[PDB]
Amino acid sequence: SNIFKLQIDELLEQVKLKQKHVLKVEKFLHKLYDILQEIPDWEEKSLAEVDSFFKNKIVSVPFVDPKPIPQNTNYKFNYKKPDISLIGSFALKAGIYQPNGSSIDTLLTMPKELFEKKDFLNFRCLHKRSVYLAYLTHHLLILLKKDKLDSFLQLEYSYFDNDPLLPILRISCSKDYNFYKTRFSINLLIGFPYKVFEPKKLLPNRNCIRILPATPLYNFSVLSSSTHENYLKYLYKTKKQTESFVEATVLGRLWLQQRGFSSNMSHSGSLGGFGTFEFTILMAALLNGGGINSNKILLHGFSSYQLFKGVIKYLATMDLCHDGHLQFHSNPASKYIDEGFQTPTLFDKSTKVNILTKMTVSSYQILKEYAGETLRMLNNVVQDQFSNIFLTNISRFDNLKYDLCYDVQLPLGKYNNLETSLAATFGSMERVKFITLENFLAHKITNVARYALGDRIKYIQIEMVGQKSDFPITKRKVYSNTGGNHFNFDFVRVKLIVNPSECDKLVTKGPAHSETMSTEAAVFKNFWGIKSSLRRFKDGSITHCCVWSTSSSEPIISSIVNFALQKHVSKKAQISNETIKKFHNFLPLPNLPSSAKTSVLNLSSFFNLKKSFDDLYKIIFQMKLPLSVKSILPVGSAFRYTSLCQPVPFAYSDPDFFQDVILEFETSPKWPDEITSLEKAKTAFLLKIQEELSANSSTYRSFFSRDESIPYNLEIVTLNILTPEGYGFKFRVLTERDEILYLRAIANARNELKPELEATFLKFTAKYLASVRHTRTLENISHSYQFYSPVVRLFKRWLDTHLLLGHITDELAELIAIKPFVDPAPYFIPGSLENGFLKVLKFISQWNWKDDPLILDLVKPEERLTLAQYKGIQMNFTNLRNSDPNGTHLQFFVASKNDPSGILYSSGIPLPIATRLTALAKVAVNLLQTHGLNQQTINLLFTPGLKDYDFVVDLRTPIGLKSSCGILSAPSNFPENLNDLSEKMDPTYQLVKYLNLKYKNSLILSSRKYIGVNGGEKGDKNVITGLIKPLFKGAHKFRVNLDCNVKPVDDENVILNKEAIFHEIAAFGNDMVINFETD
Template structure:
């Protein structure tokens, strides 16, 4: 009970809540509920937003705050509640069906008690419907009798009755509870399945009546309620004519209930045994030792469905926010795939509601309630999540109003409701409970991140797809085994027992390689009432999901207990069998250990461990039928290699392939720093290239005979000096002198190093004009440029100077943005990625995969690498379900899913690239403001389509002002949508390779390149591969061709010449095609001198004006002429 004191403290500043700040601010704000609940009360809600906008935790703003996370969130939640609860109008049909069913059931005549044999025979002879007896089947000579008499009452129960059911695409479940009369049961029926056998007969009677009733056409089936084989129920599907309630999109279940007072509660407590074997009946003292909690709870749940309906109704009367909090909870659970059924985790909307109602009564410190009745719906929701996340109900079972019960610790969670005598979590397994807590924790984490879309992540996005969740998924054939762990007689189904065994084995064996193991037994489908039992399909498989620990999952050495610890060592040996070996490690310790060889790049260490465990502990049958859904994704990455050693290096997981280049970079850095004879000291040497932050699509291979194709950019910044010239052009020329000097000294310092000066942007005098290519004898290839800070100042002065023409100012403006992009942001971005890559080992493969994906769809030249990198960083830094992806596949799919949903037209991309600290809300608001200003200035998004900002680049246009344009951005989104849809549709049979196959049908024409010039796997240079190792010496001629990529130059020139009229698509990683789309704005137009395309004169139209149109055919010919020998053919779409 909430002490009324809370009410009094309304809106007073907090006097003494420093001890437990978090709950106190919830409680205090809870006092504001009455005001808050009326959304119209503007001031109250705005006051709450104040706190939400600032840091919610700072004590000064604790006062009337955070009833909702923010105003926006509150409004969104209101909208959501409106959407999911509005199903009144279309339920009329279902209501009619319910009434009809009720009349049919009420008409059923009583049946006299009879023996099991008689009953079965009668069903066989005169009816088609069979009796769905649960396992174990009743003995035919059993002494009890089966009977039917009029139900005590018929009620609609469950969330539909409480009006908290949510309306989604799924079918709405309506439970029609038929309460069986006391008269057909006996006192001891709670023992040995007798209740359940009688219940099964009762159900069969109902099914018979509905099946045989003439006025209705419902289709009925048997189904296990929540997958619990003890509780078959009747599932009613729409019939024809009047009985067609499919418009209501619901499913009616006829469930059976019993009078709550039928069996004494004390007999069905979790520590009692109700299933006795013959021998045990003789010796009762022994039998009591092994309780049957599942059986007991199943029985108790039968007896208390009405009691719970009343209890929950009471709770919603007491607490105004309760009903809405139930809805929010249902939505949250649904989006995470948690359901009430055994295969769905055993925690559904009902359990959520019960948990909240119980927590309103107690569960806190000294039995005080955890939740307050004054909480708003969102507060109830969040506090319940917090309770789930913080409390471990396995280690510390929670008993509410149940001082008399003594629950022994087991591996199952316990939340015992003393008033109704039931553990409401009885259907939960250790793994589903761990998963639920994990989800709760990560959702709370989400609220701490100011940059994630809380509302979307919490309620809208769906995380049902295991591919987006688990780094590794294994399918195991379901085997029916007896619970082997003990002699327990509990009614756990055999499939569940197998799951438990698999869980235990994998948990012990995988240790900290995984952070969570989730097991999903197959769903039990409904079956026809003509059969007494469900036919188990041979092929049913359980799905094991592993939430990996990326740092540890592929560890090659497992260190077990020390050899001296005899007991543990023996257990270790017993578990691992011949795989365990005693080893002496470098630090002198002698330990049991496991060594996993990493021979086959296709089979990761994790896969080896898992298959070994399955084979050893779950049997050969399980092993041969198991299917390890591995990550083929890394194999999709392109690589260039010539020897097998290199192939291995490339296939190494993570970023190891980049190490040689990183080492080479360190050598270069040292060499430059130690240069003597330069006029100025060196201030900074900064890498600015994907290869130097683990994100280039291809792993740079160092090989003396074959250099990597692209040089890695490095900027050298000298210390400031006032002797730099005062004119931008002269600065650029001075840099040439510096570069020449540096190259010269470097060549002298390292034998065999080649440094050559190259020119760029020779037609634009304001831009950087020169660079030096450094080629190490090892094959490392760097491109040095000089970064001079003063350039920016000079350029800005040019821009401000009123004396320039518009063209001159434009040029200066573009030079400024080029300078900032290349010299300011690129090094910062590279540095941020270097940091993040060490923090998230999967970031690098995922970025490379995203780039490969874009490459394969010919988009990579339009969308900058940095934009892709930011999008992928988002997946890791602001993960939507609240935790970063644990495998390449989840990371890739989540990134695609984000792109698919991201409305870049009206939402900015904001990413926090910092390692530790978070962006403050002011910075975020500034970015948001910038974005809105940009959209106001350019509503058609002609200049910048996508806005992507980060903490190191708050301007947000650095990486997108050169593209993609609207059209490409839209294509990007639609490709991501298609990919996400495909992944969703194919489920676990998903083949990611399919995402990487481009479609050529959308393009107007396709240019096929001659094979000599397509880079394929090895690059253009490697068309002829020398056979003999000693012939691979590099000649000067070879070196001069380094970095030569004619196709890229060709595409660049095509863009320059025809960019206004044609959009070109090209795979920058060496595709064999260039595709093109005509700009639709190239229609006929009146003659003038400067028509921006190759024209054909049209016959005079007679109105005096002469028209010309684009000469597409000749333009294609021009394209072919420019390409010359590089082209094979051009295909034009008809």
């Protein structure tokens, strides 16, 4: 807790530009408001002739629907002069310099005796507002034409704060007196006087409007458009009170900006409705109140970060919407009533206004948990995440922020076709409640989404995409037939963040069925109808249900949104997300009985080989060695729920088929003191296990395979039990005389062989010792992080399409992918598979190596990495980075409590492969922000390679191996000899491993190790890409230690022996090798 105020001063130094971008803006501001001073008065009229006054004139007049008729509006217009001051962000000096450009604020208040005391009937108060600004802007365009500034400024009718019932006039400049640099637009918004009425008609429950529904939008909008200066009056009172306020408002407003809550409005489908001035007036309320015993929660005698802490702790803890609120008055305490209004509420007595009624229940419901999450990530003293809490824009992409996104195409036709296209109601009470059809059906579609899902998702957000908040003078509103309607969108993004525990629960229960059936059960069977059902279970429990059909491609969340869309809001709408099905059938389908109708969170094949290992586990405990088994325990990918083609029985060509599993015996003192004798003694134990197993449990098949992964000990022989249930296991023996034997090898090795022997011991520690706690923490974390297993499955599919997986280890990819789960901040936990995968890609693009490590605490939410251990991993990361500054050999530093060293999983990977990973992730993120998620977008995201690689050796196996690998578009037995598995399996990965292991100084190779996860439908084609070292850019002369294959042409120079070396590759695999290409 020492760098935070330096971060405050640093972010302020980036944000202040407070003379050169603002003094000439004040100059043009002086010009504009003295122009509007010099605009004169205008007298009594009637709208039945102001229509002909605006008949063929260039100006137009905005309104709300319905358009005014002269019959019920025998109406009058007067034009007097307000005296202007400045308001808000500019007047409190909080200008933020976006590439987009913030707005500015202006004052057009209103006198008293030009309008009567009955502005509470059918919006003609805002009609005289509209005609007022219409004549003012026509005289402003005349003053444009006579003050010669026609060529560069532009006047624009607009919807103020995305509200169709408040129009404004914004000047924006288009290409001494012309200007384009700082934030652009100036507006022309109105004000009404302060005291207009009697005290009982400003509570938003009231009615006075035509055929008692409340009009909360109406009697909040007239109140907001009346009081735009009381807020600044007590705001400057609090400004005279506190010194913390400008720093408070600037850090709160860029907080709200980089998490996307703008102050437009939330009703018509926009993430936002909460903003900086609502934030500051509730800050001042919480400053001079906040307790039931009048506890002033904030004291205003100290700095800004603690007031930020206090105000977001308040608005995160204390609930405002569903049950009561604290209300405050100004002309000043605050106190809690417990009356929930089904609306985010905070109430006044000086203004008597409900300020957050511009903002929806769903937007408050998601913003409160944004605030709870930012409490969670700035109440932890261990890390430093100012970049997470104030720097990264989490709203800039449409799918890191939300788990699921669907289209809602609405080809409803026209406003008069709405009757028999829209399946909801369209009547007087609903359009006098919700002002426009856009926010009406947005509210209705959020209600039917929440009732269709309930606890099956966390939070909902709707947005009308393509919504436009400005319109030219040539048309009275927006009138553009976009996407199939005359309405202010083209289609609808429905967006979900999901409770991952109940994604694919195929029964959503209603109430229990009593005889006189309950009213919410009636609502349930009205909502479901043909799909609703009366129900009992295996415990004898009657309820109301509806069942679903789980599929690997389509999750049932899509079908339940499809049903609740094509029943209750339209019949001819279209709902789809083909991206979801695209990566869901990128994931390999196992050859299991009824495996197309399984889910994606289904771990049943993993449970099946776990049970077969339990049977082998029992029959290997119950036997007798001369030295009995201490612990047999599994360590493989199928046991930490990670293999791509999840294991079907009898699948030879799966390289994850043979599962790694480690047994250890007692701590016997009779181990031999030498490494090859120790390996042969361990295999003597394995030979006795094999002979007793083949003696008694004859239904298991067994052979021996020589391990070659640990370098320079050629005696490691592993056996291979082939279960009758259809699985294979690589049994190994761990002793207590191995790690101390390798450490004394480090000791008495030759002095220039210590890094090579430490590489050997790091491969040993990564394989036997640390892998056990690795698979423990991953198996124990997968059941709270339920999308982790499929996001690693197609993350390694992605990584094998791009064929880095022969170099980057599996466990390194597992740690890379568990980073956005154990630390999802500032984003949330991935509740969908695409969300997890592109959060992985976004992080590994965004993450820089040399300055920052990647620590990660593998713990479930709500054992954890403490401050001392965190500083220790920072210290040995600092030691690694100042022993090597630019990452020559140690290229990723990932570390946990299971590995404080960091070197373990990332050793032996080359710099072209590591930079290929980072560069390809940055290409992916750049392409996603270029085009967005589309079918061809995902398809070239998963296309293999086609970049600056230099060899393409093209390969086929004499038989396709997806039948015998378990990916279906049948193997069920083992042959009479256990050597036909050789020609049923592929050689390509270990052959290219020997190629790289011999050519390791001259060039690096690669291959796709899983041949038919990525190699076509037949499952046959694999590539081998070579890449010459940057050392071999010229033509060296022959030395003794340069490790190449040479073709000298002159006396001095040698060159790569290229043709003969890829011919020798072709001879080493010529039954497999069928084609060669240079780039």
